Amino acid sequence: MKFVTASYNVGYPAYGAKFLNNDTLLVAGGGGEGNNGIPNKLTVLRVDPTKDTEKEQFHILSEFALEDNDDSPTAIDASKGIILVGCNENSTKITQGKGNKHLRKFKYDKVNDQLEFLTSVDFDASTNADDYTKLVYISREGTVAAIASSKVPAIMRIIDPSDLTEKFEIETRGEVKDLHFSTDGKVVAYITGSSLEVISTVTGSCIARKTDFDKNWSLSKINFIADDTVLIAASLKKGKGIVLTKISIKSGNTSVLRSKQVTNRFKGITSMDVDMKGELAVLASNDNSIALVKLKDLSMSKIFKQAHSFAITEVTISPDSTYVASVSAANTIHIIKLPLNYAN
Ligand SMILES: [K+]
Ligand SMILES: [K+]
């Protein structure tokens, strides 16, 4: 079975990507703070991998130049017009205590193809330039968001993405590997390497947790796939493989619905996304593959080998499930076009 694919070098190491609509892709990344002449940017592209030339396949609509001597962005998300970007200021500034407005709010003006900076905030008050914003997610309705820094033990901050105010701070036990919101925004679930923690975004209260996973599993990624159901991807510590598990969440309780080792071909994964329909998952592996997983069967149906040269940093599915995009620190964007209703 053949898939239409296309690739493009965006000109800088890419660390984040998100579809803004069915064919418009936001990419973020950069050369970092050094005097290397490699910019730090947000780029909005219209994608159509069926066109004849790379410039037609990847049509640049807008670019926003971040500071040349800013760090490169590390994480982004977008919902309901709000774009949130995690990006450190210059390291000297951070270390001196001048402030680090590391969570930034942008919008993209569709009518005009213009990106605009709106506001930014220093949430962490960090003076350690080695710490960065590892996770940024916004809920589907766009009224709550969560961020988490790279520092361990991690703090997860639940925030209002309209004005960048903090709702509350969650002091977690150790490293936060990933997090995701329920579609109604009322619940946030996060994972450490060995546990699932489920928290109310309304009260900050604990809803449920699970710590009794197989001792050979290192939890890696989490996404909601139905109202009260999460998909967790884990890697094997000893041996090689990826396990996917579906877990329902109740007040005070969780239940494992279904679990399957979907492959022994990958040691780890760098990124995962699930489509709006909850039918398709996409994985990026440590060895630079993109994999398609049909969730109804938990079956890995296709692997694209060497989709990027190294360091796939994010994979994202368009809202209509037509396109899978991935980006990498090797400066490339890879697009796969999927058949209608593929995940069935
Ligand atoms: K630079
Ligand atoms: K996630």
Curated annotation (Swiss-Prot):
Q: How does it sit in the membrane?
A: Single-pass type II membrane protein
Q: Name one GO molecular function term.
A: guanyl-nucleotide exchange factor activity
Where does it reside? Endoplasmic reticulum membrane; Golgi apparatus, cis-Golgi network membrane
Q: Name one GO cellular component term.
A: endoplasmic reticulum
The residues exposed to the Cytoplasmic compartment are 1-344
Q: What is its main location?
A: endoplasmic reticulum
Q: Coiled-coil annotation: which residues?
A: none
Keyword list, A-Z: Endoplasmic reticulum, ER-Golgi transport, Glycoprotein, Golgi apparatus, GTPase activation, Membrane, Protein transport, Repeat, Signal-anchor, Transmembrane, Transmembrane helix, Transport, WD repeat
The WD repeats are found at 259-300, 302-341
Q: Which GO terms describe its biological process?
A: endoplasmic reticulum to Golgi vesicle-mediated transport; protein transport; regulation of COPII vesicle coating
Superkingdom is Eukaryota
Family of this protein: Belongs to the WD repeat SEC12 family.
**Function recorded in the entry:** Guanine nucleotide-exchange factor (GEF) required for the formation or budding of transport vesicles from the ER. This function involves the cytoplasmic domain of the protein, which is thought to interact with the small GTP-binding protein SAR1. Required for autophagy.
The remark listed among the other comments is:
In the process of transport, SEC12 itself may migrate to the Golgi apparatus and function in subsequent transport events. Present with 6160 molecules/cell in log phase SD medium.
Name of the protein in its database record: Guanine nucleotide-exchange factor SEC12
Instruction: Please name the gene that encodes this protein.
Output: SEC12
Placed within the complete protein, the shown segment runs 1 to 344 of 471
